[PDB]
Amino acid sequence: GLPGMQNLKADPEELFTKLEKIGKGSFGEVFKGIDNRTQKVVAIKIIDLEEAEDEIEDIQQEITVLSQCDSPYVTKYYGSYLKDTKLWIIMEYLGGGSALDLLEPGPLDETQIATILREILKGLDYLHSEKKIHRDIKAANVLLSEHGEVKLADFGVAGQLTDTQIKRNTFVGTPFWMAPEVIKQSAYDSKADIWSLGITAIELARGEPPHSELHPMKVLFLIPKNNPPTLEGNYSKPLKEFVEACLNKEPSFRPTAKELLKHKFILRNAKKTSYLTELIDRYKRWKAEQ
Numbered sequence: 019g020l021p022g023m024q025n026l027k028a029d030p031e032e033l034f035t036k037l038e039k040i041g042k043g044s045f046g047e048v049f050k051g052i053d054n055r056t057q058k059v060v061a062i063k064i065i066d067l068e069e070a071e072d073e074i075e076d077i078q079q080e081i082t083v084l085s086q087c088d089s090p091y092v093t094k095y096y097g098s099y100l101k102d103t104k105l106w107i108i109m110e111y112l113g114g115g116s117a118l119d120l121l122e123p124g125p126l127d128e129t130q131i132a133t134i135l136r137e138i139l140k141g142l143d144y145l146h147s148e149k150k151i152h153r154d155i156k157a158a159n160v161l162l163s164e165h166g167e168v169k170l171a172d173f174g175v176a177g178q179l180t181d182t183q184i185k186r187n188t189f190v191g192t193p194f195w196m197a198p199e200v201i202k203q204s205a206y207d208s209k210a211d212i213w214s215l216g217i218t219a220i221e222l223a224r225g226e227p228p229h230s231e232l233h234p235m236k237v238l239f240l241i242p243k244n245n246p247p248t249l250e251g252n253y254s255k256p257l258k259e260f261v262e263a264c265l266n267k268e269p270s271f272r273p274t275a276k277e278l279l280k281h282k283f284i285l286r287n288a289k290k291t292s293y294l295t296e297l298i299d300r301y302k303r304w305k306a307e308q
């Protein structure tokens with residue numbers, strides 16, 4: 019049973035105006051769309067079920083995880099529709115762009131970095147409290163509203179802890195951002211997300227994660243074997259220490275999301291999310307390029 023499945027008489031090509039492609043996630047392409055009843059903009063993931071071979075269960079799991087989340091920091095799921103062989107999956111649209119998009123005009127300042135990290139941490143705190151693990155935290159999966167609100171996206175590989183399975187062992191994620199214990203397929207939990215957050219912090223500061231120049235298969239040994247990455251360059255000591263705190267090889271040595279919300283880098287530098295509109299405006303004016 020697929021949570022939020024609508025009446026199969028409903029025609030999504032009638033109910034929604036499909037616009038441009040805006041992304042490609044772990045499973046399926048995502049489009050901008052208009053809800054023709056409300057005129058609100060939505061994000062629509064479209065899946066050809068006739069093609070999908072092993073990914074239908076994955077697609078279903080993603081929708082299930084989203085449907086179980088109710089947070090200002092997690093993309094909303096509205097429902098799903100069928101048009102012949104294609105599944106239209108209707109979700110929240112955030113018009114500011116991903117944090118990675120917003121990096122294209124130039125570097126972030128540490129106030130922007132701290133603000134974005136703080137909001138990511140609020141989302142992680144929510145998820146981890148629900149015993150969920152995102153497992154694909156990276157700047158491309160951090161979306162901003164046109165007002166500067168920051169939300170987590172793409173739950174395509176998200177994990178669920180239960181009283182039966184206290185830990186996971188699945189090899190999932192995006193290689194450069196994956197925790198060493200995930201790569202080794204040791205037993206892991208929400209601390210894996212804290213490692214990915216540290217990598218994302220480096221990404222927000224420098225524009226790319228560590229090892230970005232290498233073939234992803236090399237991280238299969240590099241991340242488990244090497245000392246953890248550090249933030250190199252002219253950045254504040256609290257930011258460098260924030261990164262170090264996240265990027266410890268031992269998961270029990272990483273702070274919780276809740277704890278990092280009080281980290282000196284966050285408290286000293288983060289400001290109102292509304293200020294992030296400057297970053298969104300910067301990107302709009304920048305992509306006014308021929």
Ligand SMILES: COCCOc1ccc2c(c1)ncn2-c1ccc2cccc(N3CCC(N)CC3)c2n1
Pocket residue numbers: 040041042043044048061063093109110111112113114115116119158159160161171172173
């Ligand atoms: C240039 O920026 C234009 C806005 O770009 C986007 C891109 C994706 C968006 C979005 C806005 N508003 C909501 N989403 C969603 C909504 C539901 C999603 C489900 C699975 C995967 C997604 N994305 C996340 C961003 C990533 N970069 C690619 C895959 C999803 N993205």
